[PDB]
């Protein structure tokens, strides 16, 4: 993604060492998981709430006439 | 002599004119109203469909 090869050897392989594992991507990291669960629900609260894996179909209405 | 004859003429054509003018109005106004009455209805309906597509899609 970026450069220097001895330092980046330490890091760029460590980009993908994380990705070079995917059940806990050499660490998902319990803290990451915990705060993730916090923000993911809290995000949900900060969102609109009508389930995000469901289609909001239509509604119908009838306007004032005298 | 002259007065009473002219008084009756004035009043006579008056009741004529007013009665035909009153008549002409009630038709036209009401034809009028019918324009509008449908309108006022039908308008809001299309719109509601219109905005509803907005709202639900969002």
- Concatenating the DSSP letter of every residue in B27-54 gives HHHHHHHHHHHHHHHHHHHHHHHHHHHH
Distances (CA, A) of A29 to A22, A24, A32, A36, B35: 12, 7, 5, 10, 70
CB contact residues (below 8 A), chain B span 13-52, against chain A: 40-41, 44-45, 48, 52
- Hey, how many other C-beta atoms are within 10 angstroms of the C-beta on A36? 13
Q: In this structure, are residues A13 and A7 in contact, taking their beta carbons and an 8 Å threshold? A: no
CA angle B13, B18, B24 (to 5 degrees): 130
- Hey, how many other C-beta atoms are within 10 angstroms of the C-beta on B1? 4
Determination technique for this PDB entry?
cryo-EM
CATH no., domain A1-48: 6.10.280.200
Q: Which helix (H) or strand (E) holds B1?
A: none
Contact yes or no for A58 and B41 at CB 8 A: no
Residues with Cβ within 8 Å of A13's Cβ and at least 6 positions away in sequence, in order, are: A20
């Amino acid at each position: 993604l970026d450069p220097v090869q001895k330092l980046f050897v330490d890091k760029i392989r460590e980009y993908r060492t994380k990705r070079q594992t995917s059940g806990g991507p050499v660490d998902a990291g319990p803290e990451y998981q915990q705060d993730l669960d916090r923000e993911l629900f809290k995000l949900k609260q900060m969102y609109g709430k009508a389930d995000m894996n469901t289609f909001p179909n239509f509604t119908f209405e009838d306007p004032k006439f005298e | 002599q002259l007065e009473e004859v002219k008084q009756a003429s004035i009043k006579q054509i008056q009741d004529a004119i007013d009665m035909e003018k009153s008549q002409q109005a009630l038709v036209q106004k009401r034809h009028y109203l019918f324009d509008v009455q449908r309108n006022n209805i039908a308008m809001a309906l299309e719109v509601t469909y219109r905005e509803r597509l907005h709202r639900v899609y969002r």
